[PDB]
Design a protein around this ligand. Structure first.
Ligand SMILES: CCCCCCCCCCCCCCCCCC(=O)OC[C@H](COP(=O)(O)OCCN)OC(=O)CCCCCCCCCCCCC
Ligand SMILES: CCCCCCCCCCCCCCCCCC(=O)OC[C@H](COP(=O)(O)OCCN)OC(=O)CCCCCCCCCCCCC
Ligand SMILES: CC(C)CCC[C@@H](C)[C@H]1CC[C@H]2[C@@H]3CC=C4C[C@@H](O)CC[C@]4(C)[C@H]3CC[C@]12C
Ligand SMILES: CC(C)CCC[C@@H](C)[C@H]1CC[C@H]2[C@@H]3CC=C4C[C@@H](O)CC[C@]4(C)[C@H]3CC[C@]12C
Lengths: 397, 397
């Protein structure tokens, strides 16, 4: 257990965060002009929010692995004597949340001299970078170095051998692609959409512009960076092991992401010019996003977790040896993993008709956190099945 | 050590309290009308503030006794297996501070329907009562019962035998008499000064009234309730032990409080009628408040702590066996205890000439909080000397 002050700091930051969030809500309800546009701020802060909300759930994941004898430290190939318990993750998440809440509160009131308001969204992320690559031996220097080595080995060519940490982080990126998109948005917005002379330009000067729409495919390209990484890693694992089934079908699972993304982007772009087969590119997209979903869903239950097993009839469609205490848990997860993997059926269908303007954005940002929550649920069973089945073949018996 | 969640709650409440205090400061600077009077609110909330600030320091006192082998549990005659560590006191103080900050913030903004603003100052204290006498077995039921038994044995006649807990609490009340006065103020103000029909009467309807001045001696009487208790307890100890010196001189030390209080009150009251010898009742008061101070100061060093000892020349005017690690500490305390026991020399002298209106109140409430700090310093050495000298004769060898 963390000796005496890590728990105290966890509580301190958790206590500051709640009241800062309530102050944020109240200031948003009351002291907003409701005259100029408001969407750029949401699109810029959505990334930081669902990153802090990713760390806060990874903490609970660590706790859940520890309290069930999973032995995750041996799986990840981590140093046995030194490793981060859940309290350190809670504390880092709380500190980043305090910084994020402060930087967002500083744009609503904007209590400051002539210096503009568009500095806080930048500076915040600057800190989030200058805290990660800090060369000094302070603020978890033993952790960020391993994190950066892993992130470099993942974000690169298949030149490196694939281990469980590489695959795990590359897959976590796959269900986290809103930060990448919602960082390219900030870059492209500060590039050619913000007039620096206006000291309030962070909120646009009217109640649109070419910043978000799929125009030159840059957004469509960045939509699947992680899919590319996982595809290439599966190809490399096959090249090095020559067993076709698992890794080839895995790469097939990710190719559907390429297909769905390109079809959706092409349909959305041809809608503008009013081309002929806008009914076709709308249909075919829906086809791929269907099969892709199925191609993923089965793989989450058959190969990832391994629940629908032939034997273990007493456990009623579970494994023969389960770890977590209460069986009912699994069942709910299944239902949840069936719902939240679909995800995109309700929001395209909510947008059947033009109910209101900025129809797309509001559903898009209410589903991102549920997407990152599905990944928080996925780990509990991926790591568990890895513990007592070696379904990945990383470990050599 | 508190197992896992008491430290977390200490941190949670400490984290909420800081930001609530900053919000209080900002709302006081910005959203106050600066048109009607503001003093009743300060006089009503001063008591809760310097009570929470008393508990928060008693926590550190407990920690300091524990970290020096004082064995305070045997001194107070407490149950050895069950007793409150410093974390529980920190947590109670933090919870009360959150409640107080919320109740004060609810009067500045007053965000509410037609219900008036003068309810929050009442309800707060109501809770502080309905949390202390709670008959259920919840929220430290083992502590408040002993506290109430002790408070009943102290607040009564000399019919009860005097033990160390009785003397200690009765003496702590002596340097805490601002809560009593600043509760009688609330009572006398809600009695005949607040027009209930006005839904903003908590702040008076103008930019005075007979509520604070010494008029019928009620304030002057309540000024020394604790002095009466300590005087009577010393008399009882003498009656039961027949040793004249310590307890008789002790009672002499408290009689000077009666004298100083009555002289000050009589002078302040005769100033109004413009009687003849207003120069005399101003002089004589100053005399008593002088000797009283000395009568206390020596007793804080000679008999209470026991520093100016004949032997122990190497320790340079300290005891022969000291407990606390660093000697220098003692010296500062002495100087501090020489300054803060005087206290009333700067404040009357700051009021030589009419520098500004509400001159008396501002110094009165800026020194209330240091007076309670002098008592936080006094304990560190009173209990220590009790440990290895038995200077009180409670313990029977
Ligand atoms: C505009 C938006 C852009 C924002 C840019 C900022 C980028 C990141 C912001 C802050 C970075 C987060 C802080 C770094 C997290 C450290 C967590 C950590 O150390 O996890 C490792 C942990 C065990 O590793 P140990 O530290 O014990 O290793 C000691 C033995 N070698 O092992 C674990 O239990 C696994 C946990 C790994 C956590 C992975 C966190 C990665 C999140 C970033 C990826 C997505 C960003 C695009
Ligand atoms: C308008 C203003 C009016 C406000 C009215 C409200 C009045 C009080 C408000 C809240 C009361 C505070 C909560 C009660 C404090 C409990 C502290 C406590 O329990 O201290 C006792 C502690 C050891 O006792 P144990 O609980 O371990 O006993 C178990 C073994 N029998 O022993 C210790 O270490 C000594 C600590 C004793 C603390 C004394 C606190 C008393 C403060 C109140 C006196 C002044 C009020 C006028
Ligand atoms: C229905 C939707 C909202 C969610 C349903 C599934 C969620 C709530 C369930 C599924 C998996 C569950 C986790 C499964 C395993 C553990 C470890 C156990 O030792 C403590 C509970 C804990 C930490 C559970 C927390 C709640 C949990 C996440
Ligand atoms: C000069 C004024 C403001 C104050 C000077 C005296 C104060 C600061 C000194 C006097 C007595 C000191 C305490 C004496 C004993 C202890 C216990 C020790 O194990 C830790 C430090 C601690 C807890 C000290 C805290 C600081 C202290 C209160």
């Amino acid at each position: 257990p963390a000796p005496a002050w890590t728990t105290f700091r966890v509580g301190l930051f958790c206590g500051i965060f709640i009241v800062l969030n309530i102050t944020l809500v109240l200031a948003a309800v009351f002291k907003l002009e409701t005259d100029r546009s408001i969407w750029p701020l949401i699109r810029i802060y959505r990334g930081g929010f669902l990153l802090i909300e990713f760390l806060f759930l990874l903490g609970i994941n660590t706790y859940g692995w520890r309290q069930a004898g999973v032995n995750h430290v041996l799986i990840f190939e981590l140093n046995p004597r030194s490793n981060l318990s859940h309290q350190h993750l809670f504390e880092i998440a709380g500190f980043l949340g305090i910084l994020w809440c402060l930087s967002l509160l500083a744009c609503f009131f904007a209590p400051i001299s002539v210096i503009p308001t568009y500095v806080y969204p930048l500076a915040l992320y600057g800190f989030m970078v200058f805290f990660l690559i800090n060369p000094t031996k302070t603020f978890y220097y033993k952790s960020r170095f391993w994190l950066l080595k892993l992130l470099f080995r993942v974000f690169t060519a298949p030149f490196h051998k694939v281990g469980f940490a590489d695959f795990w982080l590359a897959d976590q990126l796959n269900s986290l692609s809103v930060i990448l998109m919602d960082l390219e948005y900030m870059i492209c917005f500060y590039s050619l959409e913000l007039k620096w002379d206006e000291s309030k330009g962070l909120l646009p000067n009217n109640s649109s512009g070419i910043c978000h729409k799929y125009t030159y495919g840059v957004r469509a390209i960045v939509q699947c960076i992680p899919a590319w990484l996982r595809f290439i890693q599966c190809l490399r694992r096959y090249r090095d092991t020559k067993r076709a089934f698992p890794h080839l079908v895995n790469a097939g699972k990710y190719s559907t992401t390429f297909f769905m993304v390109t079809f959706a982007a092409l349909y959305s772009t041809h809608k503008e010019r009013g081309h002929s087969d806008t009914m076709v590119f709308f249909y075919l997209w829906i086809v791929f996003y269907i099969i892709s979903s199925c191609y993923t869903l089965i793989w989450d239950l058959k190969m990832d977790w391994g629940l629908f097993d032939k034997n273990a009839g007493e456990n009623t469609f579970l494994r023969e040896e389960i770890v977590y205490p209460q069986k009912a848990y699994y069942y709910c997860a299944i239902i949840e993993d069936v719902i939240l993997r679909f995800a995109w059926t309700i929001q395209i269908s909510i947008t059947s008709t033009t109910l209101l303007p900025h129809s797309g954005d509001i559903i898009a940002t209410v589903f991102a956190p549920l997407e990152v929550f599905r990944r928080f649920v996925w780990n509990f069973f991926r790591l568990e099945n890895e513990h007592l089945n070696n379904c990945g073949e990383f470990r050599a018996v």
